[PDB]
Amino acid sequence: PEGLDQLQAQTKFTKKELQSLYRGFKNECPTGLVDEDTFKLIYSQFFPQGDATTYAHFLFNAFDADGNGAIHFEDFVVGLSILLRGTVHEKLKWAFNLYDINKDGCITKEEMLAIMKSIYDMMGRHTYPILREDAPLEHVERFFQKMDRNQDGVVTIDEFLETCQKDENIMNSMQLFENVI
Ligand SMILES: [Ca+2]
Ligand SMILES: [Ca+2]
């Protein structure tokens, strides 16, 4: 059908790259539509060992567009644009949205604690001797003390930006750590 050329018109890509991203979605999910459950199967294939189950759910929230639980290849191609054609700013927004799934739109050292636990349970790598054992607290503590501050108590995209912007190497490290995920 003309569902192809049409999608291309919306997205900002060439009929070539468009037909490419489409095939990938058809090769990784020759079913038609995608669902939360599937999203898990995807991250599972690229990361079988470990958990990734909790973080997988959070990932879904990142995608989608004010819709229900059923997604498609479109919203997926668009995201690709955010990652492909997107500077650190757009990324900061995408990463910030991930660190949040509950109501409201603010962050807190609490929600951050649960996030660290998820990544901690996912860390299935630990070969070779290692001294440091575990301490997901000191980290979330320095991050909140460095960013969180205003009376609002909770960190918002603003407070977040104010930090990641006037940052020196803090949020920069976060990106390096997120690069793996
Ligand atoms: Ca929140
Ligand atoms: Ca705050």
What technique was this entry resolved by?
A: NMR
Residue range of the domain that includes 102: 1-181
Assign residue 68 the CATH number of its domain: 1.10.238.10
Of the bound ligands, which one is closest to the alpha carbon of residue 163? Answer: 2
Cα(88) to centroid(ligand 2), Å? 22
Cα(15) to centroid(ligand 2), Å? 45
DSSP 70: E
Q: Could you give the C-alpha distances from 96 to 35, 74, 112, 172, 175, in angstroms and in order?
A: 23, 22, 11, 14, 12
Which residues are within 5 Å of ligand 2 (an ion), measured at CB?
Answer: 148, 150, 152, 155
In the numeric block, the tokens 């191609």 are attached to 77
Determine the Cα–Cα distance for residues 33 and 130; give it in Å rounded to an integer: 44
* Cα–Cα–Cα angle for 107, 109, 110, rounded to 5 degrees: 90
Q: Could you give the C-alpha distances from 117 to 38, 51, 104, 113, in angstroms and in order?
A: 23, 11, 21, 6
Determine the Cα–Cα distance for residues 127 and 138; give it in Å rounded to an integer: 23
* Cα–Cα–Cα angle for 26, 28, 33, rounded to 5 degrees: 60
Q: Could you give the C-alpha distances from 91 to 53, 58, 123, 146, in angstroms and in order?
A: 23, 16, 23, 20
Cα-flanking dihedrals φ and ψ of residue 107, to 5°? -110, 160
The count of structural domains within the chain is: 1
Spatial CB neighbours of 62, under 8 Å, sequence gap ≥ 6: 79, 94, 97, 98
Of the bound ligands, which one is closest to the alpha carbon of residue 143? Answer: 2
